Design a protein around this ligand. Structure first.
Ligand SMILES: [Fe+3]
Ligand SMILES: [Fe+3]
Lengths: 170, 170
């Protein structure tokens, strides 16, 4: 575990910076695939994984990687903050400032994020009993991030997208 | 595109926050798999993708997504900052502070990162002219992120990992 303040701050910065590069490259990979450049998309995804390794290395160096129940709890805390504090305020500020796209993106998140913390809660209860959760698949709306395990609505409650649009994790 | 200064800053913060969440959940997926929780891992990977949706949404609202050659230039700039500014300073700081774990992870990136800007440049000259890149395979070292196109090295020059350790993007 890194203990010195500046170095710790620097690793935290580098974690956020590699998180954002990894993310950009993922977003850029999708765009490349769409514009008909599949080897470029593969390039972005490979380098996106390189940045995952760097962020993960920094993360583990800060001592932030624990066992699954502890990791689920960091996630519960993170999700709670996003949905109880950050998105409600950001949404309100976008509305107050008349920023319509930002009203959209924060609105989607505000309605799509709630379930996360709940799902991590359940998971942690079963993982601390030394068991896995009993889930089959998870549906994610590609438009607004709406999230459902096992069963899902015929249309996304957030954006109206049909279930056939949903990304399935199984 | 979001213009007003506060809604912009907040969207930038949301982007960084959702990038870190996505990243943490990928890292937690790995640890769940390794501890015998493939369904919790499945959940982490699913939710991680939902975070990519929100991040993407804020990224696009900020007007930061464009054409592939334009995205490749954004990558060239990011990568260059990391090579020449961020990591050299952080690594010396870690050194100066005696934090050996930080020295390693910043050294790993210092060496393994230099690759990316050049790969993105060779990719940009092709995409400029409406062509894809010819590269068939990309190998990433899972320990240090060392990056090699088409053939993995017999060992990783940076961490010394054997050839068989490299992750393949085909
Ligand atoms: Fe939706
Ligand atoms: Fe390596």
């Amino acid at each position: 575990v890194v203990k010195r303040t500046m170095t710790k701050k620097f690793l935290e910065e580098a974690f956020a910076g590699e998180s954002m590069a990894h993310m950009r490259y993922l977003i850029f990979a999708e765009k490349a695939e769409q514009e008909g450049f599949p080897n470029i998309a593969k390039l972005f995804r490979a380098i996106a994984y390189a940045e995952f390794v760097h962020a993960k290395n920094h993360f583990i160096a800060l001592g932030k990687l624990g066992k699954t129940p502890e990791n689920l709890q960091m996630g519960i805390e993170g999700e709670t903050f996003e949905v109880e504090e950050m998105y409600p305020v950001y949404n309100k500020a976008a509305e107050f400032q008349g920023e319509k796209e930002a009203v959209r993106t924060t609105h989607y998140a505000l309605e799509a994020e709630k379930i996360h913390a709940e799902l991590y809660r359940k998971a942690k209860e079963k993982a601390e009993k030394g068991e896995d959760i009993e889930i089959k698949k998870v549906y994610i709306c590609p438009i607004c991030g709406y999230t459902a395990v096992d069963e899902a609505p015929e249309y996304c409650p957030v954006c109206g997208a049909p279930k056939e649009k949903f990304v399935v994790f199984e």
